[PDB]
Amino acid sequence: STIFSPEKALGLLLSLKLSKWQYITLRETTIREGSKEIYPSYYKVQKAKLQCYPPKAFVAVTDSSAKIALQALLDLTVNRIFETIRSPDAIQNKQLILISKWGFDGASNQSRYKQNIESGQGDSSIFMTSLVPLKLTADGDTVWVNPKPCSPMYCRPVQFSFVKETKDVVINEKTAMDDEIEALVPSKCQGHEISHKLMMTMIDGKICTYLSEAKSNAACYLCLAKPTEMSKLDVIASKTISSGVYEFGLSTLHARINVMECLLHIAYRLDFKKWSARGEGHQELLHSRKKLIQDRFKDDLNLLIDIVKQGSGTTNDGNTARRFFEFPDKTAAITGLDEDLIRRFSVILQAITSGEIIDVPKFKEYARTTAEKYVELYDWYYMSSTVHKLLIHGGDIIAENAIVPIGSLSEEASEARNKDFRRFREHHSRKKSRQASNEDILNMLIISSDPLISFTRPKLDAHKRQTYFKETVELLQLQD
Amino acid sequence: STIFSPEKALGLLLSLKLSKWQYITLRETTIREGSKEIYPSYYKVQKAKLQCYPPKAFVAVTDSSAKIALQALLDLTVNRIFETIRSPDAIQNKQLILISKWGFDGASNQSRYKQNIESGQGDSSIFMTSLVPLKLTADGDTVWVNPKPCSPMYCRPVQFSFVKETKDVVINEKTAMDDEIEALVPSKCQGHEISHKLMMTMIDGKICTYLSEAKSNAACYLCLAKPTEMSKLDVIASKTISSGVYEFGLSTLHARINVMECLLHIAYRLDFKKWSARGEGHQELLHSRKKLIQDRFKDDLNLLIDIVKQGSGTTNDGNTARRFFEFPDKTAAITGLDEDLIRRFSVILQAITSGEIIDVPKFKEYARTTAEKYVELYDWYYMSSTVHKLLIHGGDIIAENAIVPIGSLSEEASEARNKDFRRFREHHSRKKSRQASNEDILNMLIISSDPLISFTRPKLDAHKRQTYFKETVELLQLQD
DNA sequence: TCTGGCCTAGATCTCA
DNA sequence: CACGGTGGATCGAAAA
DNA sequence: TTTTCGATCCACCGTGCGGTGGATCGAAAA
DNA sequence: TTTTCGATC
DNA sequence: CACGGTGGATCGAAAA
DNA sequence: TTTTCGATCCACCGTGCACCGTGAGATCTAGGCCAGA
Ligand SMILES: [Mg+2]
Ligand SMILES: [Mg+2]
Ligand SMILES: [Mg+2]
Ligand SMILES: [Mg+2]
Ligand SMILES: [Zn+2]
Ligand SMILES: [Zn+2]
């Protein structure tokens, strides 16, 4: 007879970020005072962690990697989700389809243990694939929806290996996942069968240009258009898209930062107005303007702009992208760009990252108007692949992945697990053997992202929704 | 009326590493389950934190720094210490002296916030001063002793500022702290006057050469001995010591790593047998042997040797050294050094870092024998300033600081506080304003290192003992 | 004509 | 030999 | 017999120094 | 040619 | 317009 | 009235890319070239 059910104790251990010693200490220090039954014995929590694991035969953990068979992971994910549904009896005998999004990214700047000289690459950086369930569709009628589709609390890991992400490992992992996705059957939970629809939209431009048939990052992966070809519009409108590439959903996170960098790189060269930095005094005018723009940003908006930092690279952050767009008048006064163009870009990014249903006709109209405005204002600086992919091909990309609103398709989820992965590799693994450390990092990822647990898990409800701009409210489609 | 005393709740908050939200979640979730009282309201803990602060007029927190007047911090430290004494009346009306060790170090590669552009140096690296009480002496008879003299749980902060530790700022803070030590009056705690004796031994060699009357790091700051002179023993024995520099006690942490690195830098160039790598083919042989030794260490002992790390310089950790001295036979066959030299160095390092009383006649004998052995073995590689300070001047700097056994005078604590400072700046500050963030980092340092709290606060004990090498135990002074 | 010794000069170590 | 940890594995005893 | 719970143990981590931009590959400018 | 610039992470 | 969070400050109402 | 205790807020963090050795300073080896045998 315990006051906390071992699963509620597991939720308390996950939300408070406690460790075996810390939980045992909590328990014993509650015992010492005179209230015996307040927490289950850690044995019970170690036993309740087991409901969340896929069977041992499906998970393959070794020194330099840890993978789970995608079919088994999805079986388990659905079996857990059905313990969240209000009344799984209520839904009638109509076929079920779980829509989820998966994708991989590389987390660098890992702490390098001195142990287990293994065989591959040591451990400096991991490259992992994540599968987050977005929605459960019963013949169109949504029965279960992920309340925070970009949160890391539902993002399931498939496999993670200590290999630096390069073109070949990316291609091989994508081929493996495609074979595993083809070869999977609908799961079965309490007589209801669930067919899985997996979209690889948690992805970033580097991996995306890897996957498509396109050689350099200078060209769009959808139109194979060379960098100077992307100025004029008609040659682009007559282009023929490569096949199945809309599956590489518009990356909403990196769009912010990269279009920010595009507007910046236009601001830096406003004194000589050319795309290349080649010439007499081009570099020098560029660098003087660069330093002045950095310092003016620092003064007024109190934020670092394009300064190198260990790990991540630049301190060109997500929140820096938010703040570069928050007040277009101020940012225009600082950089010298046109305020209406920056405002148009902020509106487009709000519409995309909103997570609300977007109307393709009005969005395409907005986007082509914005591209005309851009070419009019700054035609010399050729649009970078992300801002081009955003303006021209954004409408079609939104239209294809219409089942779930784009912006619910964000790679941010996977990026968030980086901040979680370290916190599980440093403080929650057992360091005896590398195999044990990886096995427990994977156990922690599974337990943390379990829908039944992460449903009844304390959290912070302090993010009340923000007010859109005067134009996104027309661009979006609200039902309320 | 409650079950957990607010001070014990505060201990449970500091030990479990809980935040305000996590504590409130703990409390409310325990309430919801039918236990009306198991934890005090977070208001009670916020009010119990105030016991541990020094008065507001002595703590000066600003955007770029936060300091405390030394006399007030010491008043508070003793006032707390007298709350953990077994018997406060049993100590008689006899003079009391608290012997404590203080010193500063710089922690670079901090989290670089984008905020509060205030003029100086931004915030990338802090330079902070620490004061840890070692022992309470009643006319030679100990009443209170710090059970773990290098544990960051007792290390009190004096001041911390966001500036790069450099010769000028180091000299200025040393001058200021010397003045503050001169002007301090004995504290008055419940009819007992406690006079303070502060020794600046938590210090690294770089700061130590900054402070002494010595200009270059390559010279032994005690004897101002140039690196080419440091081979001959008698000539050095003739050298007159700088004034009062014995106060800068033996740095037990860094001496270990620098001895490891001296033995290594002897191993690397074992082929051509000269100090400098200046020559024809010297660089190439040196680097080839260096790569060979690195790979052999990798294979046999599974530890990184002299390859760069991010943020902490090189991958030469304290544990890398402690493993480099675990079995001198292996490392001897690995590098090419003599086994008995490494054995002797490991023995004196156990003697120093043991934290037990040392017999300076036997230690001086052992050290001059080891110097003779080093010269007879390798005369060409001029002893590195740290290993020379360790062998020649080690007996004298031990005998001077004989009141508390050296190794209890260890800078480890200061260094260890870095790992905590980060964990408090990132996870426990309030990020609204830099001034607020520094105020809360300082409050967290104070509370975490409060002797009354950190005494009765749960802790982990698995490191009970490690057996000594035979010559070390013949060198030490055991009393138990 | 041989030969060692002074003397700039910049490349190397050392500590963090 | 710095100190505070890291979580399953496993033995052993007490329940049940 | 089977479950439950503490107690030990394994063999390592992370605070111990930073710096400036890099990797890669096509693609545009001279 | 060829020789540097840049987009992406 | 990502999401989970950071702790004192202050208000307001309830308990004493 | 004074102490308690929850609610709300403030304005930001951190996951979003790299390698490779750095920094300040005196100090030491190179070897260059001239003054007596
Ligand atoms: Mg990426
Ligand atoms: Mg230092
Ligand atoms: Mg340090
Ligand atoms: Mg990433
Ligand atoms: Zn295109
Ligand atoms: Zn000396």
From TrEMBL, chains A, B:
Record-annotated disulphide pairs: C220-C223
Binding of Mg(2+) 3, residues: D105, E415
Keyword annotations from UniProtKB, A to Z: Calcium, Metal-binding, Zinc
Positions that bind Mg(2+) 1: D105, E165, D204
Binding site for Ca(2+) 2: D204
Binding of Ca(2+) 1, residues: D105, G106, E415
Residues annotated for Zn(2+) binding in this entry: C220, C223, H388, K389, H393
Gene Ontology MF term list: metal ion binding
Binding-site positions, Mg(2+) 2: D105, D204
Protein name: Putative DNA-mediated transposase
Taxonomy of the source species: Eukaryota, Metazoa, Ecdysozoa, Arthropoda, Hexapoda
